[PDB]
Design a protein around this nucleic acid. Structure first.
Ligand SMILES: [Mg+2]
Ligand SMILES: [Mg+2]
Ligand SMILES: [Zn+2]
Length: 462
RNA sequence: CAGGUCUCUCUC
RNA sequence: AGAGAGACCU
């Protein structure tokens, strides 16, 4: 992706979109009980922790575009992947505006406690001033679709979250692009069924992990991915995507049977317009991180990508022996023979992709189930039942979370949730964690899940 | 102060 | 069916 032009909102006739500059995050009662190196992201340019220019850091993920049109390696990949999806028989018919707004069995409803985005966000209109979960009225939507139409600008906001202090130093906070509700709807009307299939079938057929549950899915992955493991993260995946991939996406959608006017919407997220404060900018390429289908389209593009890279990098590759699951830019894959990921990253560079070890190690080492990760979690065979696999969120990640809060009101829920992550690291670590929670007044007040109840409840999922 | 997922908690 | 929250990915 690459920013094409930037114009004053005076010149574009775009309403200013301004967001909060102070974080909700406050140290918690547990801040000094546990060790941690994270602090809230830089939200304002006059942040004293800054060592570089904020806004230039913010937008530096737009590294540019390489390809615009697929090459032969990428065409082949797109058609291999689309053939794989054919067996899912996706309903390419348009989803009803009702089901699009209020969801189905395999698709959540539009998030009503979230901004309606441009222009509503500046017109003081919330999503609930238009949508209503009880009525399931759609008519108020239709009037509004007609009024403002589609292809409405994305509202750029900086993301409130804990980041490493290196990334605070360098001001590399995360950008998200608030989608206008109109676009959200129309995309869900076009692809809601595809969403449904993908959510219902995490695994190696969709090649997506969206809609998986790590407590049960982790035991299937060593079976889903047999052979030699390999894995990736990207630095700045979303913005690094050149339009080629979006073209390649189009081919996939055409092949599985989308109409041409359905497939047309892909250029509307390839080529986007964004308002950040008092300016308007154009982005060519780059996934609007924050549109409908973000995680799915990322995951779909990833599947195209891996294949394209394999067959451009290595002789004798047979993509039928490829197993990969992807969650956005997260990849866990396997092949009958060890894959040299340093060479795939080389090829990645030529497509404008910056690829890294999934651990953000400084080099690519052998990947096996004892060091593999996915969605931050590791893989730990249960000591009693070795065929059942624990998802292991690192204690130091859990430690980072617990040290802050956006609202101490939820301390109970927050701590309980972390506990449900932490017990997979086994009895010893969990009581070490619990003891530490207990060593502060507020911890002794909290309802903390018993280890053996957790384990028994995990066992009975099977 | 976005798009999604999973899970938990509280209700009716 | 409604209200919280935490975590994950962009
Ligand atoms: Mg990344
Ligand atoms: Mg990642
Ligand atoms: Zn443009």
């Amino acid at each position: 992706g690459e920013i094409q032009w930037v114009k004053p909102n005076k010149e574009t006739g775009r309403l200013n979109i301004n967001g909060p500059t102070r974080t909700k995050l406050e140290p918690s009662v547990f801040h000094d009980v546990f060790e941690g190196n994270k602090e809230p992201a830089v939200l304002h340019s006059k942040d004293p922790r800054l060592e570089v220019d904020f806004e230039q850091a913010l937008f530096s993920k737009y590294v540019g575009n390489t390809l615009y049109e697929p090459d032969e390696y990428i065409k082949e990949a797109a058609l291999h992947y689309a053939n794989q999806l054919k067996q899912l028989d996706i309903d390419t018919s348009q989803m009803s505006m009702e089901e699009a707004c209020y969801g189905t069995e395999n698709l959540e409803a539009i998030d009503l406690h979230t901004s309606a985005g441009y222009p509503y966000s500046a017109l003081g209109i919330k999503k609930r001033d238009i949508l209503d979960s009880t009525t399931r009225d759609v008519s108020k939507m239709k009037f509004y679709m007609d009024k403002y139409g589609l292809d409405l600008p994305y509202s750029t906001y900086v993301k409130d979250e804990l980041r490493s202090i290196d990334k605070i130093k360098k001001g590399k906070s995360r950008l998200i692009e608030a989608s206008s509700l109109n676009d959200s709807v129309y995309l869900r009307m076009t692809f809601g069924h595809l969403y449904e299939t993908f959510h219902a079938n995490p695994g190696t057929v969709t090649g997506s992990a969206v809609g998986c549950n790590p407590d049960t899915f982790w035991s299937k992955l060593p079976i889903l991915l047999p052979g030699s493991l390999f894995a990736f993260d990207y630095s700045g995946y979303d913005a690094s995507l050149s339009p080629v991939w979006f073209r390649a996406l189009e081919l996939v959608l055409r092949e599985i049977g989308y109409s041409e006017e359905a497939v047309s919407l892909v250029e509307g997220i390839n080529h986007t317009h964004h308002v950040y404060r008092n300016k308007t900018y154009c982005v060519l390429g780059g996934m609007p991180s924050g549109c409908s289908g973000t995680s799915i389209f990322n995951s779909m593009i990833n599947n195209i990508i891996i294949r394209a890279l394999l067959i451009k990098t290595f002789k004798g590759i047979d993509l039928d022996e490829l197993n990969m699951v992807a969650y956005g830019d997260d990849v866990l894959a396997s092949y009958p023979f060890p894959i040299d990921c340093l060479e795939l990253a080389r090829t990645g560079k030529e497509y404008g992709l910056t690829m890294t070890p999934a651990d953000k190690s400084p080099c690519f080492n052998e990947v096996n189930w004892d060091n593999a990760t996915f969605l931050k979690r590791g893989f730990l065979p249960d000591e009693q039942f070795p065929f059942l696999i624990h998802p292991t969120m690192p204690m130091k990640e859990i430690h980072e979370s617990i040290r802050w809060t956006k609202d101490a009101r939820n301390t109970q829920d927050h701590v309980r949730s972390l506990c449900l992550l932490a017990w997979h690291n086994g009895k010893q670590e969990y009581e070490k964690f619990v003891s530490a929670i207990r060593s502060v007044p507020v911890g002794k007040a909290l309802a903390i899940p018993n280890y053996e109840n957790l384990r028994r409840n995990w066992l009975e999922l099977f």
